[PDB]
Amino acid sequence: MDVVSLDKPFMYFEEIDNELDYEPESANEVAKKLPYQGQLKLLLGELFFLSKLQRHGILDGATVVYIGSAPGTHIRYLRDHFYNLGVIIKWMLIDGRHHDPILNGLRDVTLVTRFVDEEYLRSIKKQLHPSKIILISDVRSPSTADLLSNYALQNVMISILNPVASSLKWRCPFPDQWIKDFYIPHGNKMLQPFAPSYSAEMRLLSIYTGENMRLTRVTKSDAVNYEKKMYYLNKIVRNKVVVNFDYPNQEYDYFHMYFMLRTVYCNKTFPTTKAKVLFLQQSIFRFLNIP
Numbered sequence: 312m313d314v315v316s317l318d319k320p321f322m323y324f325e326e327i328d329n330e331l332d333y334e335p336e337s338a339n340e341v342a343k344k345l346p347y348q349g350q351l352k353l354l355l356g357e358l359f360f361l362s363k364l365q366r367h368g369i370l371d372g373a374t375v376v377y378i379g380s381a382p383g384t385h386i387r388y389l390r391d392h393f394y395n396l397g398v399i400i401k402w403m404l405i406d407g408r409h410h411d412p413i414l415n416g417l418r419d420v421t422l423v424t425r426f427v428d429e430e431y432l433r434s435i436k437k438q439l440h441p442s443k444i445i446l447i448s449d450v451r452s453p454s455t456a457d458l459l460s461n462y463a464l465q466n467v468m469i470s471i472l473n474p475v476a477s478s479l480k481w482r483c484p485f486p487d488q489w490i491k492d493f494y495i496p497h498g499n500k501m502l503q504p505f506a507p508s509y510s511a512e513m514r515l516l517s518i519y520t521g522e523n524m525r526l527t528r529v530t531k532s533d534a535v536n537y538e539k540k541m542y543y544l545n546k547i548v549r550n551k552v553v554v555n556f557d558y559p560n561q562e563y564d565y566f567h568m569y570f571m572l573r574t575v576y577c578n579k580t581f582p583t584t585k586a587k588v589l590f591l592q593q594s595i596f597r598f599l600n601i602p
């Protein structure tokens with residue numbers, strides 16, 4: 312077995328301390344071990360992001376605009392969590408597909424069946440005004456062309472919506488499929504426990520200060536780096552059993568999950584962080600119907 316002692320998991324991309332040549336054969340290997348793993352991946356990352364904003368005092372009173380939200384089953388838990396905490400938030404979930412019915416009948420959450428384009432972003436910006444906006448984008452068209460298009464849309468979301476913070480889907484196009492260099496917003500490249508086995512996707516977290524917008528250029532050389540670093544993370548790291556991690560499940564992803572969950576705010580007082588995390592994890596798994 313693959314046992315190890317780790318102080319902490321890699322929380323952000325920049326922390327990954329090694330790389331591996333990508334093996335195309337890994338694409339044929341099982342991508343998911345848990346039912347509803349995708350909803351879990353999203354729930355952990357979004358809970359982490361939103362808790363950070365709470366920590367900085369910018370969540371309460373904002374309207375969370377989530378684009379690419381359907382089905383969005385996990386969003387009900389996110390909404391309940393902050394709603395039960397006392398935080399005041401309006402949710403506006405926009406997608407061309409239908410949302411999970413469990414999202415209906417909540418006055419604080421508005422569902423919109425529309426694929427957004429630049430023009431629509433402007434109308435909703437006029438309609439939300441003057442509320443503070445928090446953007447979460449999980450739009451998926453794929454080809455590098457599809458990706459660039461999505462990234463180009465996500466940048467437009469930020470320029471038009473002008474949010475106080477954003478969480479964006481971010482997967483660098485593959486080096487052998489480069490088309491052109493492009494810019495993405497500057498942010499923390501948050502790694503995602505429970506992402507597909509060989510997924511190179513992460514979430515770009517950003518907080519906007521002043522009236523500036525900093526972007527960063529991404530080149531094919533960056534793409535080769537993303538490829539090698541995420542390959543090492545997936546093939547080696549995520550397959551480690553953290554023996555010094557005293558917890559019911561010692562797999563790397565649960566170790567990573569623990570670290571994201573220890574930052575989440577709860578009403579109930581716990582004697583230890585271990586107790587809080589166990590509580591949240593149990594609550595989460597129960598909600599998603601994961602054993």
Ligand SMILES: Nc1ncnc2c1ncn2[C@@H]1O[C@H](CSCC[C@H](N)C(=O)O)[C@@H](O)[C@H]1O
Binds near residue numbers: 378380382383450451
């Ligand atoms: N311009 C656009 N506007 C809104 N939604 C879009 C879009 N382009 C793609 N999408 C949506 O992006 C979604 C990608 S999957 C999103 C899953 C969702 N975040 C959840 O929590 O389950 C699809 O629902 C797709 O319809």
Ligand SMILES: Cn1c[n+](C)c2c1NC(N)N[C@H]2O
Binds near residue numbers: 338486487509510511
């Ligand atoms: C097809 N896939 C999948 N996958 C994750 C990768 C691919 N192609 C690449 N050139 N690099 C990768 O990181």
